């Protein structure tokens, strides 16, 4: 006898698992087992990972609820799991959104001089270098804080948050609630500090002060705050990370968009698609009994949507393993989502690994890793894949 599958499969963010060819083309929803014990059920093919996120009886809030089977556990108070449907009816989304849209001015220009400026220090120093640390995530964090608004020294202490934040455990972390509190605290002496004035939290400091928000919650503006820095942190450091590593064990490809930079759109919308930095499923709870594909998913349900599954997929994605920069659904991948919950800082994230990748590839285009693939080191029990340190040298 053998226990039910168990998820995840992998927590290495290199190569994905056979299982999962296995599981799309035999059983493309099937039942698993996650790490508190919970029965899901885990879709894997293009189809149903689309069908899933379009329907909104597949629900993210009730994910939250009190009994439910999880995933794993909360990282945030309950209501925070429904964010951007709090936003949302605050009427503060177009704000939100228009704050971080890459296309502020100079906006650009400052990541490419931060991007220069780190990858300068780690010429001078030598290598062998670490491009997670002393590359990606401090990109990511610089570009935070300015879209933020906030002072670029106070970024180190919040990023330092979220190895805990983003952990996908079995069990409450105390710890989480230690940092969550701090940098709530935090982001409301932001929002009362006279100095804020640029960026999203100059824009919510300005709109808590206006008749028409005037009982939106203090407790929502200040997680407004944390929430898109955790998760636009995370995830861009953590994309890059792992799209760099995509991009050095390709030396053809990395060649061609040395050579022809104009082409480094097209090579980050396939390095989305292969990307394996989401660890776990999107988790959904089903408030009906919906069919999908051959199982009835009853009310109650905990539905995971793999969107490795989905974006490896031969039958959406001929040679679905191979970086193509001319396929003719380039942009129709899962990387960021589908439906009511689709990504808000998608163009923010593909400009800041477009532009970690041009900065990268001029200043280091010998680069190449320093120790064998198999020695980086995976972090588990985490909701991104990432290797805790990416040797490379040049
Ligand atoms: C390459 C970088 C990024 C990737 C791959 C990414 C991926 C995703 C995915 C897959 C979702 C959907 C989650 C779901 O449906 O359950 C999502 C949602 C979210 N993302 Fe991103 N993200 C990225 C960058 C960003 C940035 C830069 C921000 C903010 C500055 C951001 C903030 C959020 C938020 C707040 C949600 C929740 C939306 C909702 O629930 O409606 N992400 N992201
Ligand atoms: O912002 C966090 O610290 C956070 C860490 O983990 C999550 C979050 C969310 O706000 C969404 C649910 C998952």
């Known amino acids: 006898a053998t226990v039910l599958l168990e998820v995840p499969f992998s927590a290495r963010g290199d190569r994905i698992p056979d299982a999962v060819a ?3 083309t035999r059983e493309p929803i099937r039942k698993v087992r996650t790490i508190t014990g919970a029965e899901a059920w885990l879709v894997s093919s293009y189809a149903l990972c689309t069908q899933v996120l379009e329907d909104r009886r597949f629900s993210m809030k009730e994910t939250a609820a009190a009994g439910a089977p999880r995933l794993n556990a909360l990282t945030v108070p309950p209501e925070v799991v429904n964010n951007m449907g709090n936003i949302a009816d605050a009427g503060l989304r177009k704000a939100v959104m228009k704050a971080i849209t890459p296309k502020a001015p100079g906006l650009e220009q400052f990541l490419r001089d931060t991007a220069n400026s780190l990858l300068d220090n780690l010429i001078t120093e030598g290598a062998p270098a670490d491009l997670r640390n002393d590359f ?7 570009l935070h804080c300015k879209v933020l608004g906030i002072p670029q020294e106070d970024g180190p202490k919040l990023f330092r948050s979220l190895s805990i934040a983003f952990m996908s455990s079995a069990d409450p972390i105390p710890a ?17 500090n006279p100095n804020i004035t640029t960026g999203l939290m100059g824009e919510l400091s300005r709109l808590r002060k206006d008749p ?10 200040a997680t407004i705050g944390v929430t898109f820095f955790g998760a636009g942190v995370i995830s861009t450091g953590s994309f890059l990370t792992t799209a760099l590593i995509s991009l050095i064990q390709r030396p053809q490809l990395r060649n061609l968009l040395h050579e022809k930079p104009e082409l480094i759109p097209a090579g980050v919308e396939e390095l989305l698609r292969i990307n394996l930095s989401f660890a776990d499923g999107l ?3 089903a408030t009906a009994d919906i069919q999908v594909g051959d199982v009835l998913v009853r009310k109650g349900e905990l539905v995971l949507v793999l969107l490795e599954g989905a974006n490896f997929d031969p039958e959406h994605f001929p040679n679905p393993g191979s970086i193509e920069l001319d396929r003719p659904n380039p942009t129709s991948h899962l990387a960021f989502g589908r439906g009511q919950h689709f990504c ?28 064998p693939i198999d020695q980086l080191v995976w972090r588990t029990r985490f909701q991104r894949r990432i290797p805790e340190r990416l040797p490379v040298l040049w």
Do not use: C
């Open 176 to 192: 989480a609630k230690i940092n969550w509190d701090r940098d709530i605290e935090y982001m409301a002496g932001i929002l009362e």
């Open 22 to 24: 296995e599981l799309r």
């Open 212 to 221: 028409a928000y005037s009982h939106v919650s203090d407790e929502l503006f």
């Open 283 to 285: 988790p959904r709870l």
């Open 136 to 142: 990606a995530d401090p990109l990511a964090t610089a």
């Open 344 to 371: 808000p800082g998608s163009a923010l994230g593909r400009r800041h690994a477009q532009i970690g990748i041009e900065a990268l590839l001029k200043k280091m285009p010998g680069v190449d890793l320093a120790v």
